[PDB]
A paper describes a structure:
In this study, we present a novel DARPin–apoferritin scaffold, with a larger size of around 1 MDa and higher octahedral symmetry, meticulously engineered for the binding and imaging of small target proteins via cryo-EM. The 24-subunit apoferritin framework allows the attachment of up to 24 target proteins without steric hindrance, an extraordinary feature. The modular design of our scaffold allows the adaptation of new DARPins through minor amino-acid-sequence modifications, enabling the binding and visualization of a diverse array of proteins.
In our comparative analysis of the structures of models 4 and 6, we noticed an unexpected outward rotation in the linker that connects apoferritin to the DARPin, resulting in the formation of a two-helix bundle rather than the desired four-helix bundle. To facilitate two-helix bundle formation, we incorporated a glycine–serine (GS) repeat linker that extends 12 Å beyond its predecessor. Our scaffold, with its high-resolution GFP structure, outperformed other reported scaffolds by requiring the fewest particles, thus reducing the demands of image collection and data procession, and setting a new precedent in efficiency.
Numbering used by the authors:
A (entry chain A), B (entry chain M): 54 to 374
C (entry chain L), F (entry chain F): 227 to 282
D (entry chain B): 283 to 374
E (entry chain L): 339 to 374
């Protein structure tokens, strides 16, 4: 009923064994709320926590102070207990009264391997306590040096991915604006080409769908969209249909280069979902766009444009309409 | 690895406790195939089998001789071990090399309460061994008196239910034959009533569906259908429509009485499915048949039959057609 | 009598140590055809003015 | 929920026989619960048990015993082309 | 009656040639292919 | 510019600490209507013979 806890505290693995074989209280709440699992985690005793878990102990046991065996085990420094608790269902994001999470304590105490296993199981790096500190702060105010480095790397990966997605949103909005300009150039009455105009209006709308997809993505990730100013296109007079097609080709190539840079960034920081998203929705459309626009340019050049009217007229009639 | 079995045999519950707390072989196969559970069941040691089941022992462990902890526990006489094994998934119908089932041994040894708990969990009373004996035989050739009585009661319940279902099949076949006779009486040309004929032919076919339902039932239960001779109806001349309706009424009442006797029999022998079957398919149709045939008889009697032609003519026209 | 024999045959193949379903359907069909056969002869004997006398 | 006793059910015959024993154990538990509800005068529980549970177990046991005798007569498990043709003709 | 006798003799010779009654998989396949 | 402002407004109400979906649909609809409005004026200025000069 109560005589098991002192044997757990003294490390009497055989005594708690023989006394738990006989019907005994496994989920004992004590004079301050310390279950035998808590005391078996404070001291480093793997056999006791194993034979206690097998007999039906609770890994999440709300101590009178707000602690859990994972808290005390991460604070102590015993890695095997941390592993066997994480595999049994311990919650990596449980709070104290101060608000500390097991990673706060892992960073304060200075346990690198425990920090790694806690980061693998879903502990978040920018979580705060009541007083406003993140594990990186408890790491830098205590001289624990490498905890700080491996947490700074993750903070920086998240910040840089957020920034690159914002820049891609701005780049697609700019491309949409450039295509709108191109389209209303071919609508003048000294440039009377209607299917060039329809072509570039269609591209203008597709490029806005592209940017809204990235906005939705960044809201799904929990990041912050920060919209910016959209530059005006470099020209108002796109001299001909050939020159406009070549400018669209260079623009599509620049967009594709930015996508490749963002993909390499998401690969460095171990982000499978971002890489899958980029290559599923964005890398096969750019290849097809570049192929098609290069086809248009060689067709127009062979037919004899720009020095030939009746080349752009018949291209506009037969290929674009 | 092996040092746990002698402690199980000596009844050292605390030793096997402390030694199983430390990583030890729970499903140990030994020099003749005797697992610690077998030896913990032979001797009466409930704590050891509990702490062995909790640590992942197999209740069905094919000994080199064909035994299982349930076999040895039923032979010994310890009821608590039998219960905790039956609740953990022990198979009540496992065989030896001789072919004995745990009930064979429960009946040989003379353990009444174990026989009861084994009968509650699905042990069958007429199972045989290689030499052809049923638990009742091992009970009567050993002077074990009450095992024999409580097994004879069950053998007799099954035999009597089988016999009553056979008799009900024969009774419905006879009723079908009687209705066929009645129907082809009203088809003569000195008895020119067509809707009386259609009525009784319909009843003739319904009563054969009734008997095929009981044949299917008896095949679902695992019993043996034994068909018999069908008597001929008592009359070939059913004097009038009134007299034929009254004879049908008495026949339906006799059939209903037999159904009630069979239901009381199935209630005495604790057979919920048979009772549910009888009252679902058979007891509400008889009530409606009796109500309808009594209605027909009072209508015919009030209109003035049998001493009135133009009473049965108009009944045949208006009520039966 | 033939109808009764076919009914017996049909419910033999329905046991679970004799698990043949289409043998069972076959013999049930024959069981019903043989009762139609006998009702035809009953109708005939009523058309002729004779007396049906059913037996065991 | 305990894990099943085997991961390797040696053949189709052995798996059908194991399913048969499992259905019989389930039916025994239902009968015990029905007797309990009868002792304590609980008409609605008894009606529920025999309406939804006692006629399905009987049909399951009949069908699984049919499958076992068919497979045994065709010549399984020592015969391929017995379980192949059973799988083709009876189960599909 | 003539058609019934012809058909039932056909069934008997088919079953005998396939190898029944000493062969399961003869009555199984007869039941599957001829009667259903 | 008004179209851009409405797009910002719409994707604000899509965050998961601001879980209002019909506010989001509302402001997206307004965002698209305001671009139709500007394309109408571009077409007008091409009908008049003037020069469109787009800006930041």
């Amino acid at each position: 009923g109560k005589e098991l806890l002192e044997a757990a505290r003294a490390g009497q693995d055989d005594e708690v064994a023989v006394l738990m074989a006989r019907g005994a209280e496994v989920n004992a709440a004590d004079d301050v709320g310390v279950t035998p699992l808590h005391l078996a985690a404070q001291r480093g005793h793997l056999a006791i926590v194993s034979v206690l878990l097998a007999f039906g102990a609770s890994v999440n046991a709300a101590d009178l102070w707000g602690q859990t065996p994972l808290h005390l085990a991460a604070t102590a420094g015993h890695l095997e207990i941390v592993e066997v608790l994480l595999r049994s269902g311990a919650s990596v994001n449980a709070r104290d009264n101060i608000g500390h999470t097991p990673l706060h304590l892992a960073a304060w105490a200075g346990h690198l391997e425990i920090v790694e296993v806690l980061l693998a199981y879903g502990a978040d790096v920018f979580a705060q306590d009541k007083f406003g500190k993140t594990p990186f702060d408890l790491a830098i105010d205590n001289g624990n040096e490498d905890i700080a480095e491996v947490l700074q790397r993750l903070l920086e990966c998240r910040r840089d991915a957020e920034a690159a997605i914002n820049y891609q949103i701005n780049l697609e909005l700019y491309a949409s604006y450039v295509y709108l300009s191109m389209s209303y150039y071919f609508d003048r009455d000294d440039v009377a080409l209607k299917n060039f105009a329809k072509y570039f209006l269609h591209q203008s709308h597709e490029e806005r769908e592209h940017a809204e997809k990235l906005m939705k993505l960044q809201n799904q990730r929990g990041g912050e969209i920060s919209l910016q100013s959209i530059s005006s296109p470099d020209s108002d007079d796109w001299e001909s249909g050939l020159n406009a097609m070549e400018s669209a080709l260079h623009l599509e190539k620049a967009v594709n280069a930015s996508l490749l840079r963002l993909h390499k960034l998401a690969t460095d920081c171990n982000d499978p979902h971002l890489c899958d998203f980029i290559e599923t929705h964005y890398l096969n459309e750019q290849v097809k766009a570049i192929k098609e626009l290069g086809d248009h340019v060689t067709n127009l050049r062979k037919m004899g444009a720009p020095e030939s009217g009746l080349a752009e007229y018949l291209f506009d009639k037969h290929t674009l309409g």
